[PDB]
Each structure stands twice: as structure tokens, then as C-alpha cells.
Amino acid sequence: NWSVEDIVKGINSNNLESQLQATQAARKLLSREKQPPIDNIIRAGLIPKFVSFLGKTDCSPIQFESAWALTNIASGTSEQTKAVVDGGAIPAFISLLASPHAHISEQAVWALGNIAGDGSAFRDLVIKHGAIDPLLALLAVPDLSTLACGYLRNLTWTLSNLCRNKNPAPPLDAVEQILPTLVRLLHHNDPEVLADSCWAISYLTDGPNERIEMVVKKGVVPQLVKLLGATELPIVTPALRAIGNIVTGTDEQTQKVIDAGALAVFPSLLTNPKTNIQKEATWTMSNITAGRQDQIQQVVNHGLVPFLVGVLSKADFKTQKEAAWAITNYTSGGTVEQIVYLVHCGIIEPLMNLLSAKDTKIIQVILDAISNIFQAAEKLGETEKLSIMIEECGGLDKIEALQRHENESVYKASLNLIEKYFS
Amino acid sequence: GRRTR
Amino acid sequence: GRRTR
């Protein structure tokens, strides 16, 4: 391995072959695992030279070595990615996308993915320089199976970075231009391509209903539900995130998730050994139980109420809090019969046990659910039985003790429950 | 309601 | 986010 001084000496030689050998030495330095001297290379002023080498069409080896060196610098901190951008690398890398050498074109795809992945500013700057058209042109083949596997994975990952980040979200016209190609990748049978395609879809659905509608209006929901039942965790995780984002939109958008058969996967999702899967699946359920009464009935018909009782009874606390939200949304919009069925499944006891949690909001969420269930019992004239049930679980002790909680939203709800149904 | 998060 | 080669 060369020293930085010897690399600088070789690059300043104005001997193209000496510059090639020095650039390759810099690339090997930047490719080591333990502490690549990225800042030393930047401080030596080598980035503008590397960028100049990207345009030497007659010497494709130095194009590849400098692109690889710049890619490793752009993969570091935001200051290091900025130094690559400040060297003029964005238009130079976009020109390299048309290289007849696949390994050079792939290196440009890789570098632009690192630059765009820094944040919304560099993402939009890459788009302004016109990267989308040559990127999509590399995928303009009738069957993606004819492309090299690693080449296709790099293009998918880079496209997903162009869909990533908010404040602001990517430009609408850029999303519309990318979506048809993204849908192709979402149907390609390669685990890495599927994972990164799902991540891109999860980014595009993380926004207002207009953004969700753009994705739904491509027919990807059935494929997302199919990927939701995959065996690879790197696929289920972004697929579930995308589904969870879609059910935060309108009730019609939520209905297409249900029509695609998503609720049949949730018995295994709500009992998944991975904590994050259970949390996001319960979060997804909370936004479905916030829908119409016929959609709440879909949750009931798929046998998912006992699974919500289970998650509320025993899970990580963050998952249990998502379950409390699911119950409050359920009891807020459900019919009297649906609320009675929820109590019959045993929701009361695990609901009262969580009134001992230190989190303030979950106490308010539970007290709202208890209030909604009493209103269903008032319509049936069965408030006395519910008060007994809440009593025998030890819940009356907690509702009574919650009157000297400091938060003012808790004593009001606790006192109003004590007055109206107990005292 | 829906809790975007 | 970003991958090194």
C-alpha cells in the first residue's frame, strides 16, 4: 500500500500511466476495512484530479479506478460526500452512465446512489443534473433477467435512494417517471432487488394521501401483500412498512390493502419473533381499526381480535402501546356488537394491567378506550357488569389511584369514570 | 384517527 | 443509506 504523499506525487506527474498507477493505489487504500484515510485523501486535494480522470474516455482503466476511489469517499460522512459533490463529480458521473464498459457504468450508478442518499438536497441536485433518464435507460430491456445480477441490484438500490427522504419529498414528476420501472423491479425474483424495491415503495408511501394514491394507482398492493408473506426478513420488513403507510391514508386506500388479502398474514405477523415486526404489524392494525365499521368487521372475521388481546397481554412495551391505540380506535368507531365481542374476547384484564405503566400517553389511551366501552354498555344498560369486571381485575384501584397523577388529562378522565360508573 | 408515524 | 465498495 502506497502512502498519500506517493499518491500525490504520482498524480502530479502529468504522466498518464503514472497517474493511473497512483490512482489505483489510492483506490486500494480507500478499499481497506480498517480506517480508510478518506480525510487524508481529501486534504491532499486529490478529489478534483479524480473527477478530471472520469472524463478520460481514451483511458477507461483510469476512469474505473478514479470512479471507484470517489465512490468510497462519497460513501462516508456527509462532509465527505459533499467534498465529492464540491469537486464537480455529479455531472461527470452522469456522463459515465453511457460508458460501454459495464463495470464503469455500474461504478457511476453506485456513486450517484451514495450522493443521492445523503439527503433531499443532494438527491434533488442529482435529479436536476438529469440522472433519471440515463439510469432508467440502463433498465430498458424487455426482461430484467438478461441483466447481470450485481448490476441490477446496484441500479435498484440507487433508484431507491432517489425515492428516499422527506422535507421535501422527491419531485412529483421524478416519482412519476421512476414508478413504472420500480414496479418492474418489485416483480423481479431476486431477494435483494425485492428488498430495495420495497424500501423505495415504503419511502414513496410515507407522505400525504396524494403520494399514497400515486403508488396504489400502479396496482402494487397485491404484490406487496405477496411479499408480506415472504420468508426473508429483509423483504417482509419494508413490505410491512409500505403496507402500514398505505393504511394511514383514506378508507378506500385502506380497503385495497384488505381486498388484497393482507389480514390473512397478520396472525403470524402479530406473533413474529422479531420485535420490530410485531410493533409495525400492530401499528398497521391500529390504523385499520380506525377505519369504517365494515373494515373493523373484516378484522373480526379474520380472527384478529384474539391476537390483539394477546399482543396487549404480553409483548414489548412499544408493541403493547400500539395495541392500546388499536383498541381505542376499535372502540371509537365500532358498533355496540363489535365492542361487546371485544370484551368477550377478554380485553378488559390486559387493558387494566397496563394502567400501571409509567408512560403517560398510554394511560390516556387506555382511559379513552375504557370510556368508549362504557358508552357501549350504556346503550345496553350493562354498565353495572362492566364496572364489576373492571373491579375484579384490580382496575378500580388503578383508576382510583390515577386521580393524583400529575397530568391533568388523566384525573379528568379517571374522575369522570369514578363518578359516573363507580361512586 | 389515523396515526401517521 | 450509503455503501462502501
Author numbering:
A (entry chain C): 75 to 497
B (entry chain B), C (entry chain A): 212 to 216
What does the published report state?
NLS2 is highly conserved between different strains of influenza A, with the noticeable difference that avian and highly pathogenic influenza A strains have an arginine at residue 214 of NP (NLS2-R) rather than a lysine (NLS2-K), as in seasonal strains. To visualize the interaction of NLS2 with importin α, we co-crystallized mouse importin α1 lacking the N-terminal importin-β-binding domain26 (ΔIBB-importin α1) with peptides spanning NLS2-K (198-KRGINDRNFWRGENGRKTR−216) and NLS2-R (198-KRGINDRNFWRGENGRRTR-216). The crystal structures of ΔIBB-importin α1:NLS2-K and α1:NLS2-R complexes were solved by molecular replacement and refined to an Rwork/free of 17.4/20.6% and 18.0/21.0%, at 2.25 and 2.10 Å resolution, respectively. We unambiguously interpreted 8 residues for NLS2-K at the major NLS-pocket and only 5 for NLS2-R, supporting the idea that a K at position 214 of NP-NLS2 results in higher affinity for importin α. Likewise, in both complexes only five residues of NLS2, the same that bound at the major site, were visible at the minor NLS-binding site (212-GRK/RTR-216), albeit the electron density was much weaker. Similarly, the refined B-factor of NLS-2R bound at the major NLS binding pocket is significantly lower than at the minor NLS pocket (76.0 Å2 vs 113.0 Å2). To decipher why an R at position 214 results in decreased association with importin α and reduced nuclear import of 5GFP as compared to NLS-K, we carried structural alignment of NLS2 with other classical NLSs solved in complex with importin α. This revealed the critical position P2 is occupied by R213 in both NP-NLS2-K and NP-NLS2-R, in stark contrast to all known NLSs that have a K at this position. However, in NLS-2R both P2 and P3 are occupied by arginine residues (R213 at P2 and R214 at P3 position), possibly explaining why NLS2R is even weaker than NLS2-K. Likewise, the residues surrounding P2 and P3 are not likely to make a significant energetic contribution to the interaction with importin α.
Unlike surface proteins, which are highly variable between strains and mutate easily, the nucleoprotein (NP) of influenza A virus is a highly conserved protein with roles in several stages of the influenza infectious cycle. The primary function of NP is to encapsidate the viral genome, consisting of eight segments of single-stranded negative-sense RNA, into viral ribonucleoprotein complexes (vRNPs). The best-characterized NLSs, often referred to as “classical” NLSs, contain either monopartite or bipartite stretches of basic amino acids that are recognized by the adapter importin α, which binds the receptor importin β/karyopherin β1 to transport the trimeric NLS-cargo:importin α/β complex into the nucleus. Our results demonstrate that NLS2 is an atypical monopartite NLS that binds weakly to the major NLS-binding site of importin α and synergize with NLS1 to confer high avidity for certain importin α isoforms.
